[PDB]
Amino acid sequence: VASQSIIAYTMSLGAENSVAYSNNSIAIPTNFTISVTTEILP
Amino acid sequence: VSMTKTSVDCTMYICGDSTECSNLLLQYGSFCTQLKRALTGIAVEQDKNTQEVFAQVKQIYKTPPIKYFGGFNFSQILPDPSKPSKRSFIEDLLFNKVTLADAGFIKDLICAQKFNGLTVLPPLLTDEMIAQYTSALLAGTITSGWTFGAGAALQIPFAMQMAYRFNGIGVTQNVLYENQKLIANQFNSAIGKIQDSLSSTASALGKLQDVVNHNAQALNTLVKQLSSKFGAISSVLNDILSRLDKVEAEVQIDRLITGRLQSLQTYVTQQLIRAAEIRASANLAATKMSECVLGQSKRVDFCGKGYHLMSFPQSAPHGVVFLHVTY
Amino acid sequence: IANQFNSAIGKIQDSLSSTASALGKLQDVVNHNAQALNTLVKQLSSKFGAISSVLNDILSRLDKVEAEVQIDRLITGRLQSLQTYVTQQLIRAAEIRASANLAATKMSECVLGQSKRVDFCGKGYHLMSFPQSAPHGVVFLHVTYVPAQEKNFTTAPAICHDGKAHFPREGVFVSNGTHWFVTQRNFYEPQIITTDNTFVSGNCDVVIGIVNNTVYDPLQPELDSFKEELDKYFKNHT
Amino acid sequence: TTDNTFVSGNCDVVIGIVNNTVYDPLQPELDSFKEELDKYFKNHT
Numbered sequence: 001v002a003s004q005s006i007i008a009y010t011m012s013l014g015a016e017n018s019v020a021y022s023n024n025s026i027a028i029p030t031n032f033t034i035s036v037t038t039e040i041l042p
Numbered sequence: 043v044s045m046t047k048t049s050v051d052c053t054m055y056i057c058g059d060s061t062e063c064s065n066l067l068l069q070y071g072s073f074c075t076q077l078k079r080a081l082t083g084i085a086v087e088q089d090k091n092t093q094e095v096f097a098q099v100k101q102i103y104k105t106p107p108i109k110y111f112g113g114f115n116f117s118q119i120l121p122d123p124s125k126p127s128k129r130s131f132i133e134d135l136l137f138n139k140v141t142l143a144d145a146g147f148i149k150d151l152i153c154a155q156k157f158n159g160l161t162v163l164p165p166l167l168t169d170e171m172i173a174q175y176t177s178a179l180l181a182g183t184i185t186s187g188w189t190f191g192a193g194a195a196l197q198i199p200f201a202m203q204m205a206y207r208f209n210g211i212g213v214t215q216n217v218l219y220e221n222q223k224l225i226a227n228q229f230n231s232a233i234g235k236i237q238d239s240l241s242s243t244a245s246a247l248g249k250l251q252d253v254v255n256h257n258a259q260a261l262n263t264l265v266k267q268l269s270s271k272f273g274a275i276s277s278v279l280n281d282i283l284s285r286l287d288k289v290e291a292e293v294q295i296d297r298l299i300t301g302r303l304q305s306l307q308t309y310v311t312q313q314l315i316r317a318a319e320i321r322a323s324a325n326l327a328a329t330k331m332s333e334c335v336l337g338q339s340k341r342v343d344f345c346g347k348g349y350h351l352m353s354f355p356q357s358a359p360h361g362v363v364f365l366h367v368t369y
Numbered sequence: 370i371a372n373q374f375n376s377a378i379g380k381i382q383d384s385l386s387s388t389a390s391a392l393g394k395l396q397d398v399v400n401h402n403a404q405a406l407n408t409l410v411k412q413l414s415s416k417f418g419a420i421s422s423v424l425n426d427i428l429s430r431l432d433k434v435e436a437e438v439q440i441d442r443l444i445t446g447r448l449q450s451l452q453t454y455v456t457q458q459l460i461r462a463a464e465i466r467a468s469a470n471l472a473a474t475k476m477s478e479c480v481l482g483q484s485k486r487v488d489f490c491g492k493g494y495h496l497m498s499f500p501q502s503a504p505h506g507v508v509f510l511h512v513t514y515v516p517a518q519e520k521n522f523t524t525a526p527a528i529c530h531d532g533k534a535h536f537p538r539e540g541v542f543v544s545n546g547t548h549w550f551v552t553q554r555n556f557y558e559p560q561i562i563t564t565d566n567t568f569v570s571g572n573c574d575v576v577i578g579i580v581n582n583t584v585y586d587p588l589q590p591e592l593d594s595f596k597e598e599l600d601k602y603f604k605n606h607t
Numbered sequence: 608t609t610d611n612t613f614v615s616g617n618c619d620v621v622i623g624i625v626n627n628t629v630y631d632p633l634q635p636e637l638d639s640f641k642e643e644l645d646k647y648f649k650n651h652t
C-alpha cells in the first residue's frame with residue numbers, strides 16, 4: 001500500500017559534484033549540442 | 043539583493059482586540075486586501091531576487107582536498123569547514139559588519155512592532171544555502187573557469203585559466219607564465235588588503251546597512267503613528283469608548299481608522315517604491331554574477347576598474363559582494 | 370547542426386502545446402490589470418461611513434444640507450480608491466518599462482547581433498536568437514552552442530624543444546598519454562605541434578610545468594627533399 | 608595563398624566546395640633556386 005499526503009522537507013540546492021581538478025589535467029568537449037530555448041518578456 | 047519581508051493586518055494594526063472598530067472598518071471595503079496583497083507581492087519577490095542572484099548554478103561544485111591553484115591563495119574566500127555556519131573568512135566579516143534588526147524567527151522595538159500586528163517573515167534561502175550557492179559558484183570558477191556557465195564544468199589548471207584571461211585582455215599568455223609568481227603574489231597581497239579594508243572601515247557595507255536601517259525606521263515610524271490623535275480626543279481607543287457615547291465615540295474612532303489606514307497606505311507605497319530599487323539592484327547583481335563570475339567581461343568598468351580578468355562572489359546580509367580582479 | 374536545430378525547434382512546439390504555465394509572466398500582466406480594475410468596481414459598494422453606497426438613495430431620502438455630508442463621505446473614499454489605483458499602475462508601468470528596455474536591449478544585442486555577454490542570450494555560447502510576438506510581450510528563441518561529450522587529457526602551459534619555450538598561437542596543448550598536440554579550446558581537434566601552430570618566447574626554465582616534446586618545421590622536409598634533388602644531380606654529374 | 612587559408616580534411620565532406628588553385632609563396636623561391644641550381648650544373652659541365 002502507498003498513498004498521497006503533504007510532505008515537508010529542507011529543499012535541495014542542486015546535485016553534488018566535485019570537479020576533477022589537477023595540476024596538469026584538462027577536459028575538452030569532443031562534440032556539441034545546438035540548444036534552442038525560450039525567454040519570455042512582458 | 044533583497045530587503046526584509048514584512049506582513050501586516052488592518053484587524054490588529056488599526057484596532058487590536060476591538061470588535062466595535064472591526065465593524066466600522068468593514069465599511070471601508072477592499073483596502074485591507076489590497077495592502078495585504080501588495081505586501082505579499084513584495085515578500086515573494088525578495089525570494090525571486092535572491093534566487094536569480096545566487097541560484098545560477100545547477101550543481102553544487104566543490105574544490106578538491108588538495109587546495110593548490112598555481113600559487114593563488116583562495117583560502118580566505120573559500121569556505122571554512124571548522125565553522126557551524128560554513129562561510130568563508132571574508133563572508134564572516136560581512137555578516138558581523140552589517141547588523142540585522144530582526145531575523146523573523148520564532149517568538150525591544152521588534153516585540154512592540156509585533157504587538158501591533160506588524161510581522162517580519164524569514165527569507166526562503168537560509169544564510170547557509172546562500173553560502174552553498176556562493177561556494178559552488180566559486181568552486182566552479184577556480185576549477186573550471188567560464189566553462190561551467192556554458193555547459194558541464196570542464197577542468198583546467200588555474201595558471202592556464204589565468205593565461206586564457208590574459209589573452210582575453212589582449213596580453214599574450216607567455217607574459218603570465220613569465221610573471222606567474224609575481225602575479226600570484228600581487229593577487230595574494232591584494233586579497234590580504236580586502237580583510238583590513240572591511241575590518242577597519244566603519245562605512246564599507248553602507249549600502250546593505252542602509253537597507254536594514256530603512257526597513258527598521260519604516261516599521262518604527264508605522265508603529266509610532268498609532269499614538270497620533272488625527273483630530274480625535276485621544277489615540278487610545280478604549281479611552282474614547284469609555285468616555286463618549288456610541289454616536290460620538292464612533293466618529294472619534296473613525297478619525298483614528300482614517301488616520302491609521304493612511305499610515306498603512308503610506309508605508310505600503312513607500313515599500314512598493316523601495317522594492318523597485320532593490321529589484322533593479324538584484325537584476326544588476328544577477329547580471330554581474332553571469333558576466334563577471336561565470337565569464338570574463340569586455341565591458342569597461344562593469345567588473346571593477348581595470349581590464350577584467352575574473353571576479354569572486356561573497357554573500358552578505360541582504361546582499362552580495364563581488365571581489366573583482368583586474369589587470 | 371541543422372538536424373539538432375530542427376529537433377530543438379520541434380521541442381519548442383511540444384513544450385508550448387503541453388502547458389499554460391510557460392507564459393505565466395505575460396498572463397500575470399493581464400491578471401494584475403484585470404484584478405485591479407475589478408477591485409476598483411468592487412470598491413463602489415463600500416460605504417466609507419455614509420448611510421448608503423448607492424448615490425441616488427442619498428439623493429432620494431435626504432435633502433441638500435444633510436445629503437452633502439453623506440455624498441462627501443463617498444467622494445473622499447472613491448477619490449482615495451482612484452489615487453490608490455493610479456499609484457499601483459504607475460509602479461507597474463515602471464516595472465513593465467524596465468522589462469521593455471531589457472527586451473529592446475535583447476532585440477538589439479541577441480537578434481541584430483551576436484553576444485559575448487554570458488547568459489544574456491540564453492544558457493550557452495550564443496549563436497543567434499529569433500523574436501516571436503506574444504500578447505503584451507516578446508518571446509526570444511535563443512540558439513546556443515552547448516559543448517558536449519568531454520574527455521580528460523593531460524596538458525602543459527608550454528612545450529620545450531631547442532631550449533626555446535613554445536606556446537599555442539590559438540588553442541591549448543594536450544596529450545592522450547603518449548603524443549602531444551595542439552587543439553582549439555572549445556572542440557577537440559588535435560594537430561601536430563608546429564612552428565605554424567605555436568610561437569616562441571624565452572627558454573625552458575622560467576615556466577612552471579613545461580614539458581619536453583618535438584616541434585615540427587614544415588620547411589625542413591621540403592628543404593631536405595631539395596637536398597636529395599640537388600645531390601641526385603651531383604651523383605649523375607660524376 | 609597558403610597564408611590567407613588553413614587546411615582541414617578533404618573535398619567530399621563540405622557542401623558547396625569549389626575547385627581553385629591555392630598559391631604557395633614558397634614555390635617562387637624554390638622554383639628560382641632550381642633554375643639557379645640547373646645553371647650551376649650546366650656551367651660545371
Ligand SMILES: *[C@@H]1O[C@H](CO)[C@@H](O[C@@H]2O[C@H](CO)[C@@H](O[C@H]3O[C@H](CO)[C@@H](O)[C@H](O)[C@@H]3O)[C@H](O)[C@H]2NC(C)=O)[C@H](O)[C@H]1NC(C)=O
Pocket residue numbers: 030031032033372373
Ligand atoms: C555527436 O553527437 C551526435 C548526437 O547529438 C551524434 O549523432 C548521433 O549518432 C547516433 C549514432 O552514433 C545516431 O543514432 C542512430 O544511429 C544509427 C542511424 O544512423 C542507428 O543505428 C541508431 O540505432 C540510431 O538510430 C543519432 O541519430 C545521431 N544524432 C543526430 C542528431 O544525428 C554524433 O555521432 C556525435 N559525434 C561524435 C563524433 O561522437
Ligand SMILES: *[C@@H]1O[C@H](CO)[C@@H](O[C@@H]2O[C@H](CO)[C@@H](O[C@H]3O[C@H](CO)[C@@H](O)[C@H](O)[C@@H]3O)[C@H](O)[C@H]2NC(C)=O)[C@H](O)[C@H]1NC(C)=O
Pocket residue numbers: 115117118131
Ligand atoms: C594563504 O593565506 C593564509 C592567510 O594569509 C595563510 O594562513 C596563515 O598562515 C600563517 C602561518 O601558518 C598563520 O600565522 C600563524 O601561524 C601559527 C599557526 O598557529 C601561529 O603559531 C603563528 O603565531 C601565527 O599566528 C596565519 O594565522 C594564517 N592565517 C589564517 C587566516 O589562517 C595560508 O598559509 C596561505 N596559504 C598558502 C598555501 O600559502
Ligand SMILES: *[C@@H]1O[C@H](CO)[C@@H](O[C@@H]2O[C@H](CO)[C@@H](O[C@H]3O[C@H](CO)[C@@H](O)[C@H](O)[C@@H]3O)[C@H](O)[C@H]2NC(C)=O)[C@H](O)[C@H]1NC(C)=O
Pocket residue numbers: 224227228
Ligand atoms: C614589476 O613590478 C613588480 C612589483 O609590482 C616588481 O617586483 C618587485 O621587485 C622588487 C625588486 O626589484 C622587490 O623588492 C624587494 O626585493 C628584495 C626581496 O627579494 C629586497 O632585496 C628588496 O629590498 C625589496 O624588499 C619587490 O618585492 C617585488 N614585488 C613583488 C610584488 O614581487 C618587478 O621587479 C617589476 N618588474 C619590472 C620589469 O620593473
Ligand SMILES: *[C@@H]1O[C@H](CO)[C@@H](O[C@@H]2O[C@H](CO)[C@@H](O[C@H]3O[C@H](CO)[C@@H](O)[C@H](O)[C@@H]3O)[C@H](O)[C@H]2NC(C)=O)[C@H](O)[C@H]1NC(C)=O
Pocket residue numbers: 545546547548
Ligand atoms: C595517441 O595518438 C597517437 C596518434 O594517433 C597514436 O599513435 C598512432 O598509432 C597508430 C597505430 O594505431 C600508428 O599507425 C601506424 O601504424 C604502423 C606502425 O608502423 C604504420 O605502418 C602505419 O602506416 C601507421 O602509420 C600511428 O603512426 C601513430 N601515430 C604516431 C604519430 O606515431 C597513439 O597510439 C595514441 N596513444 C594512445 C595511448 O591512445
Ligand SMILES: *[C@@H]1O[C@H](CO)[C@@H](O[C@@H]2O[C@H](CO)[C@@H](O[C@H]3O[C@H](CO)[C@@H](O)[C@H](O)[C@@H]3O)[C@H](O)[C@H]2NC(C)=O)[C@H](O)[C@H]1NC(C)=O
Pocket residue numbers: 529580581
Ligand atoms: C628536458 O630536456 C632537457 C635537455 O634535453 C633536460 O635538461 C637536462 O637536465 C639534466 C638533468 O638536470 C642535465 O644533466 C646534467 O645534470 C648534472 C649537472 O647539473 C650532471 O650530473 C649531469 O651529468 C648533466 O651534466 C642536462 O645537462 C640538461 N640538458 C640541457 C640541454 O640543459 C630537462 O631535464 C628535460 N626535462 C624533463 C622534464 O625531462
Ligand SMILES: *[C@@H]1O[C@H](CO)[C@@H](O[C@@H]2O[C@H](CO)[C@@H](O[C@H]3O[C@H](CO)[C@@H](O)[C@H](O)[C@@H]3O)[C@H](O)[C@H]2NC(C)=O)[C@H](O)[C@H]1NC(C)=O
Pocket residue numbers: 625626
Ligand atoms: C573538382 O576537381 C575534382 C578533381 O578533378 C573533380 O573530381 C573528379 O570528378 C570526376 C567526375 O566525377 C571523376 O572522373 C572519373 O569518374 C569515375 C571514377 O570515379 C570514372 O568512371 C570516370 O571515367 C572518371 O575517370 C574524377 O575521378 C574526380 N577526381 C577526383 C580527384 O575526385 C570534381 O568533380 C571537381 N568539381 C567541380 C565542381 O568541378
Ligand SMILES: *[C@@H]1O[C@H](CO[C@@H]2O[C@@H](C)[C@@H](O)[C@@H](O)[C@@H]2O)[C@@H](O[C@@H]2O[C@H](CO)[C@@H](O)[C@H](O)[C@H]2NC(C)=O)[C@H](O)[C@H]1NC(C)=O
Pocket residue numbers: 018019020025027519520521
Ligand atoms: C577524469 O578523470 C577523473 C579521475 O582521474 C582519472 O584517473 C584514472 C582512472 C585515469 O583515467 C586518469 O587519466 C584520470 O586522471 C574522473 O573522476 C572520477 O570519475 C569516476 C567515475 O568514472 C568516479 O568514480 C571517481 O570518484 C572520480 N574521481 C575524482 C577524483 O573525481 C573524471 O570523471 C574524468 N573525467 C571525465 C570527463 O570522464
Ligand SMILES: *[C@@H]1O[C@H](CO)[C@@H](O)[C@H](O)[C@H]1NC(C)=O
Pocket residue numbers: 022023108110
Ligand atoms: C601541484 O604542485 C604543487 C607544487 O609542487 C604542489 O604543492 C601541489 O600539491 C600539486 N598539486 C597536486 C594536485 O598534485
Ligand SMILES: *[C@@H]1O[C@H](CO)[C@@H](O)[C@H](O)[C@H]1NC(C)=O
Pocket residue numbers: 601602605606
Ligand atoms: C642526368 O643528367 C642529364 C643531363 O646531363 C639528364 O638528361 C638526365 O635526365 C639526368 N638523369 C637523372 C637520373 O637525373
Ligand SMILES: *[C@@H]1O[C@H](CO)[C@@H](O)[C@H](O)[C@H]1NC(C)=O
Pocket residue numbers: 646647648650651
Ligand atoms: C662556372 O664554371 C666556372 C668554371 O668554368 C667556375 O669557376 C664557376 O665557379 C662556375 N660558377 C657558376 C655560376 O656555376
